Amino acid sequence: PPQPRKKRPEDFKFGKILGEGSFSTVVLARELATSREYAIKILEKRHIIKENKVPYVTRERDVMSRLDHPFFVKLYFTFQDDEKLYFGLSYAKNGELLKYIRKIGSFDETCTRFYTAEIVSALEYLHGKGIIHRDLKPENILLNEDMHIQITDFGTAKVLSSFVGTAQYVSPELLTEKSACKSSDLWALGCIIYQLVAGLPPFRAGNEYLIFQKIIKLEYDFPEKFFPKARDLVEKLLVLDATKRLGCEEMEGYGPLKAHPFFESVTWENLHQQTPPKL
Ligand SMILES: CCCCc1cc(-c2c[nH]c3ncccc23)nc(N)n1
Numbered sequence: 001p002p003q004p005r006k007k008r009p010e011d012f013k014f015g016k017i018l019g020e021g022s023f024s025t026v027v028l029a030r031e032l033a034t035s036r037e038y039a040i041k042i043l044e045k046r047h048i049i050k051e052n053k054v055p056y057v058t059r060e061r062d063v064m065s066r067l068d069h070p071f072f073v074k075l076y077f078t079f080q081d082d083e084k085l086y087f088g089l090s091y092a093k094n095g096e097l098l099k100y101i102r103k104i105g106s107f108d109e110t111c112t113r114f115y116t117a118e119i120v121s122a123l124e125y126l127h128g129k130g131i132i133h134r135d136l137k138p139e140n141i142l143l144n145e146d147m148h149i150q151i152t153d154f155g156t157a158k159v160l161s162s163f164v165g166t167a168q169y170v171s172p173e174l175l176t177e178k179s180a181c182k183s184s185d186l187w188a189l190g191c192i193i194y195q196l197v198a199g200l201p202p203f204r205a206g207n208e209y210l211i212f213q214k215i216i217k218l219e220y221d222f223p224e225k226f227f228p229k230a231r232d233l234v235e236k237l238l239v240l241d242a243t244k245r246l247g248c249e250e251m252e253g254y255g256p257l258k259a260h261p262f263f264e265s266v267t268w269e270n271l272h273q274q275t276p277p278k279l
Contacts, residue, residue, distance in 0.1 A: 190237025
């Protein structure tokens with residue numbers, strides 16, 4: 001199938017930096033022939049080789065190519081010059097969800113229900129494909145123009161036939177066995193639901209080590225205000241035994257999770273078509 005010609009850096013007007021990865025920087029760019037705004041992730045070939053991240057960058061590019069859902073960032077193109085790799089990603093104008101958490105303080109029952117449902121729906125799609133995010137957080141959950149979610153950051157991701165993510169969202173099994181699966185994402189989800197309601201992640205401490213100490217002993221608690229049905233859901237996600245997490249294969253998958261009382265009024269079938277509640 002004759003696809004288009006390769007794009008090149010001179011086809012774009014590079015603009016502001018949108019972010020920084022571990023071996024990359026994401027730049028807002030405008031395609032001149034179209035006026036289209038893309039978030040171009042730029043990677044330096046020498047640095048990637050030097051740091052032994054060729055399998056990292058490869059996996060990332062391969063995962064993003066495999067994604068085809070409105071709740072995930074899309075990879076439109078890739079090209080390369082003599083020094084750099086460029087990945088043309090969808091641009092989420094309204095930025096990260098973490099900025100909203102900080103701005104509005106903490107979400108009401110409607111917004112929490114809506115944005116959690118989208119995260120559940122996205123994870124259901126991702127996990128049905130045998131992909132695992134391994135680093136999910138509000139920083140990774142972007143918001144497009146129409147205020148729907150767009151998950152990004154697949155560098156750290158794994159495809160089902162090693163690494164430890166952001167300390168606050170790390171699951172216990174990761175801390176002990178040095179292992180992960182779909183259950184690691186569901187733990188992270190539990191942390192997110194908590195942060196949406198409370199305004200803060202559940203396990204917080206002076207340093208990485210103390211955070212990790214709280215995680216393994218399940219040393220967290222709910223504020224007085226916390227919605228009971230969201231409190232219940234979080235309690236069925238922040239479970240130490242990975243096999244007892246609501247939403248995993250042993251717990252009979254996404255059916256029982258999408259069925260939790262917290263999501264009674266949710267119509268799962270067409271979330272992308274729904275108008276997001278005002279924050
Ligand atoms: C760990 C730090 C995240 C930096 C980052 C950002 C993005 C990204 C894709 N589209 C966007 N639109 C707006 C803002 C940011 C983005 N994508 C990746 N892979 N990484």
